[PDB]
Amino acid sequence: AGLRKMAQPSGVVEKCIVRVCYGNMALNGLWLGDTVMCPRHVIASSTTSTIDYDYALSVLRLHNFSISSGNVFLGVVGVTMRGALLQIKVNQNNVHTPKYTYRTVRPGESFNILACYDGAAAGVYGVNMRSNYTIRGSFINGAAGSPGYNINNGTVEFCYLHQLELGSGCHVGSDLDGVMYGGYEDQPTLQVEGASSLFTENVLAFLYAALINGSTWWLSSSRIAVDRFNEWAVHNGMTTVVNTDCFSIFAAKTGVDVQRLLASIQSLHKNFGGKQILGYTSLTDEFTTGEVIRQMYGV
């Protein structure tokens, strides 16, 4: 019993973190094979004006890099721009490279953050990509390059390198192809994030988890169609519901169909805060159906 936002174990990723220094910029890189990936603003020479990264790369000198794994120093062979990342070719293969892939995550999907400082992992926690392509994380200066990952059947799927903070607890990264999530710019210039909405399909997973764990005080006896709810959600800070077929397992275990849960969500959005659910805020959206199934049943 119980429901906790968990990270997957981080051991296989910890051995891939390196410290990447250039000038008086220091951040983290991801060392796989003989390449190190890191945010390109490590080579930027300013912290307020619009940066011409192509110029910054042209005035690059390879010997000013210092890349280290612990106290072991990597020799830099070449550098290429990769979107908002640098791909740094080094002279040493990482013998601890896991089997890995790249994947771009979509709004609502969960993954793990390995928060790193000075090229060493400091903390690990699970996150969920929001509708505005931001994550609710915990990062301070020094954390850029911190990777996001999932582990699927022994293969590490890398989906995130940390890039910037837009506002209190709103964090932005790029995928490993160097495409910034949400199209935010890795510039010091003014930009605000898109509107944050609760990811409704995750709230439905959480509410089914609550039912399975014996929490029913919030359960409406009313019922509302997915069509009509979506109309209401886009006026009330909630995303539309598109997949429901993923919930038939829960509807069958609980006896409660999605339409009653949508009615419940409408009613909880009114007396919002009047009572917790499983010790959480009633409209928690950080749990996916996959996470709930894994925690309730091990499947």
């Binding site: 990062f139 301070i140 200066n141 890039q163 837009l166 510039q187 010091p188 210039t189 003014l190 930009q191």
Partner: peptide
């Protein structure tokens, strides 16, 4: 606003 971290 953005702080490159």
């Amino acid at each position: 606003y953005p702080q490159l971290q």
